[PDB]
Amino acid sequence: KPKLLNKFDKTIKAELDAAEKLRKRGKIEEAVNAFKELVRKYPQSPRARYGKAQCEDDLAEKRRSNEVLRGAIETYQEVASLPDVPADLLKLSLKRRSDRQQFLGHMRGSLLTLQRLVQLFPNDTSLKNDLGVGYLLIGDNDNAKKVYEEVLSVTPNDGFAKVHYGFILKAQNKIAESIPYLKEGIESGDPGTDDGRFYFHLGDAMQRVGNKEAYKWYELGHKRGHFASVWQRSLYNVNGLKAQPWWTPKETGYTELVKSLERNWKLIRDEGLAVMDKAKGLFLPEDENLREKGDWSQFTLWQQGRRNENACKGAPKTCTLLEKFPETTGCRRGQIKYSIMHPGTHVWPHTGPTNCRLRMHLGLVIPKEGCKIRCANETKTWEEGKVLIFDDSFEHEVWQDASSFRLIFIVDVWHPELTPQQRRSLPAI
């Protein structure tokens, strides 16, 4: 290589190089002071200012300090404000600013930086692709979609843009439309396309349209390290946790929880029925595009290890019962919820996001015929007052063809091989 020195900076290259050498040697404190003296003496120097920002960035890593990094993020912007900044340096500085803003979770700030980059460099396709990612991270799929349409209108065979456009189409339930974009994008091999999310959704889109090639893409995703197996396709994993579709209570070790659920199942049922009769707006429809058809809703008591206080007013006895079991109430990668499913419902094959939980089902109102659940290659039925346990990071599928409603209680637990230290530190999902 990059051309980082403007006319004046070439005249002080020896000083600039000496400060950078301290930084590259890991003498971060000395490099900070070296670049501070250069910023003091040469306040308009873009290379000195970038050196200051890079040292602050390194110092933030050493101290693991969000606030030190915020300083670096500001100095990266100061580089761009200076006169006569070389194009290579301007781009490097603002790209790192946006990257570090995302690391901090400042997604709206990163978006502003990315918009500025695209305005400054209107012909850099990769910066537009990065702007689309900025929109995806803040949940603005509509503006992300417009960005990738702009990219594809000029570079129709950009593989990054194809896979991301395909991802957006798939999220919008444009299943058939998504498949060629996801497929061609992965096949491009372009940087950023060899990503578990795109294999996951390409295979899933193919399954939904009945294309038997779906599992070839799962096999390839497994070969490329994205999935533990073709059956277990979660993307947020602790490697090596025992992996099996169906579990017994004894295998989980959570036998006291299972006994409480089975001894007290009727109070849990009765509170669910009272909500169905008198507070039915507490049941919220499934909203993750997982149904082919039918009606399926959940009344959630805990999510991400946090009690919903107003929800627990609707099931106070059940919430009191469950408070005794931190293996589920503290499962920050799971939920506790009632789940009602009505006749005419088919839930598409799907997998959950993480291998870090197991999912218990307590039967509450189970029609004698018509309801079943498949996990991997094995299908089972529920029983009233009895717990089933499976690992929902394995592909699973559900049918409801009874002649009345089916009510279960879903209780997620930490995978039993996770240590207390892991259960305290894993990011919530």
Partner: peptide, 19 residues
């Protein structure tokens, strides 16, 4: 974004908080 409660429908499933 929403949350990945039961699947992998969101672009990312975790919330970033730096260090």
């Amino acid at each position: 974004q929403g949350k990945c409660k039961n699947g992998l429908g969101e672009y990312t499933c975790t919330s970033l908080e730096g260090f």
